[PDB]
């Protein structure tokens, strides 16, 4: 169905030693496929997926050059943003940048986004139409004006509605076996009596891709929005994800409760009853 | 591919 390509950039200043630490990662859907770290020995863009290694030397040279340009821009940005906020020279600060694009089932452009942040809070972003900016505080306004003078949004829109979709389509074609797969979760539920009277029923979900899923509890049709605990979806370390949801119930009332799971790899949403 | 246009600082 729908797919996306995303890029994340982080830069943290070290006011006592060396240049700021810079890290970049690239994702297609839920799969990381590329990375760069300024503290590594290679000082090159490195692959992280089997299907991206088909690219030739020119691809890696160009990507390395562009990402080093990114890091230089972040360094200057940290230097300027320190002055813009009247902060001392001894602290450590962070700039974060993220952009990407979406496509639908027809692999046509759907939406794009570009956002900036300083010290963990919003600084400036592009609106939904990709034609005007949104500033958070007064300090951002100056930057907004300058960029409005420099036609930055035109370049960004050209990249987001253009090159981004073409790169995404090429990646989806070259990685059809792994990028377009879907794995239905393996599901089972367990029971644990707490001390003597209450008990907990926990329904799991193992080894599913992609990472978007829904878990719910029902008591004869009653939607249990409360009285249940569910943890954040977590990676397994091999390309799949895990989740579980638990509910505490009086003993002897297990058949009254059921766990419902819906993924996109399931033709029909499931329903689990204890034993 | 990463953004390949003109770079602009804050």
């Amino acid at each position: 169905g729908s797919h996306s390509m995303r890029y994340f950039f982080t830069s943290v200043s070290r006011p006592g030693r060396g240049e700021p630490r810079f890290i970049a990662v690239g994702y297609v859907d839920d799969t990381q496929f590329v990375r760069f770290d300024s503290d590594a020995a290679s000082q090159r863009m490195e692959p992280r997926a089997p299907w991206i290694e088909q690219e030739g030397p020119e691809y890696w040279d160009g990507e390395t050059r562009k990402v080093k340009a990114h890091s230089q821009t972040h360094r200057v940005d940290l230097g300027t943003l320190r002055g813009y906020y009247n902060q001392s020279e001894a602290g450590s600060h962070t700039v974060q940048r993220m952009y990407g694009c979406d496509v639908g089932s027809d692999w046509r452009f759907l939406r794009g986004y570009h956002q900036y942040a300083y010290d963990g809070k919003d600084y400036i972003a592009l609106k939904e139409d990709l034609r005007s900016w949104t500033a958070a505080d007064m300090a951002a306004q100056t930057t907004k004006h300058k960029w409005e003078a420099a036609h930055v949004a035109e370049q960004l829109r050209a990249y987001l509605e253009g090159t981004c979709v073409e790169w995404l389509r090429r990646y989806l074609e070259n990685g059809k076996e792994t990028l377009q797969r879907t794995d239905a979760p393996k599901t089972h539920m367990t029971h644990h009596a707490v001390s003597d009277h209450e008990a907990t029923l926990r329904c799991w979900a193992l080894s599913f891709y992609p990472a978007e899923i829904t878990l719910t509890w029902q008591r004869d049709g009653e939607d249990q929005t409360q009285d249940t605990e569910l943890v954040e979806t977590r990676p397994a370390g091999d390309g799949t994800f895990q989740k579980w949801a638990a509910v505490v119930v009086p003993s002897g009332q297990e058949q009254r409760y059921t766990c419902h799971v819906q993924h996109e790899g399931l033709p029909k949403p499931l329903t689990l009853r204890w034993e | 591919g990463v953004y390949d246009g003109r770079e602009h600082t804050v």
Partner: T-cell receptor
Framework: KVTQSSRYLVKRTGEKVFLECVQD?????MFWYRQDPGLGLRLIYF???????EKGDIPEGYSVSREKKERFSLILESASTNQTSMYLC?????????????FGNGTRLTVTE | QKITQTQPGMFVQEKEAVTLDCTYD???????LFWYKQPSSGEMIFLIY??????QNATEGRYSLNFQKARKSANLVISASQLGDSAMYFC??????????????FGRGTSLIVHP
């Protein structure tokens, strides 16, 4: 606004020749081109930005220097007869989005024995 | 990433429209096409630019472009030709830098002569 040092030059073989190119638009990319009859434009050298440089398809016999942002110097170490041509300098922003090259008026150079 | 202008030399009567042809091929996801005019003085004058991801053709004064991405052609159209249009015209392309080379590539050149 791109300016080259001279418009006409005549030199003797064996001399060291200097060619200058200055722009004031605060452009990153700079290029040195050579024009010959029936051969079109051929790139000698180009520079992404300050202090870095890369060879073109005919870099033999020339050297370059990009110590500054707004200057791109070309040097002929030993002038030879087969270096008689017209030389052009260009500058532009980075990337393919509405970024054409901006040429100067050119410099015609003749090397005689 | 290469450009070819097949036809050397064109002739046109004054107060008439003429078309100069240019065909390109590339695999770079992002690129732009653009045209120059060089008179007898020897300078290069920028005429028109068009990217690969914009609807409509670029128009500027008497200069327009016939851009066919499907068959990879970027033809330059001159309307109401004048005597001062006799020059050498160049077709050029540049790319993003990861799907191909970064340095611009130029066409061979096409000469245009206007007759009174």
């Amino acid at each position: 606004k791109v300016t080259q040092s001279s418009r006409y030059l005549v030199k003797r073989t064996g001399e060291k020749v200097f060619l200058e190119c200055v722009q004031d638009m605060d452009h990153e990319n700079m290029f040195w081109y050579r024009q010959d009859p029936g051969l079109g434009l051929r790139l000698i050298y180009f520079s992404y930005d300050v202090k870095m440089k890369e060879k073109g398809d005919i870099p033999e016999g020339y050297s370059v220097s990009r110590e500054k942002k707004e200057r791109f110097s070309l040097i002929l170490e030993s002038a030879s007869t087969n270096q008689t041509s017209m030389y052009l300098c260009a500058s532009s922003f980075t990337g393919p989005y509405n970024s054409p090259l901006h040429f100067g008026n050119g410099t015609r150079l003749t090397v005689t024995e | 990433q290469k450009i070819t202008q097949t036809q050397p030399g064109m002739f046109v009567q004054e107060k008439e429209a003429v078309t100069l042809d240019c065909t390109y091929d590339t695999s770079d996801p992002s690129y732009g096409l653009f045209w120059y005019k060089q008179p007898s003085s020897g300078e290069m004058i920028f005429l028109i630019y068009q990217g690969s991801y914009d609807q409509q053709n670029a128009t500027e004064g008497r200069y327009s472009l016939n851009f066919q991405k499907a068959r990879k052609s970027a033809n330059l159209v001159i309307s109401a030709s004048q005597l001062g249009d006799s020059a050498m015209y160049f077709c050029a392309m540049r790319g993003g830098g990861s799907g191909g080379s970064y340095i611009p590539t130029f066409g061979r050149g096409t000469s245009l002569i206007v007759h009174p």
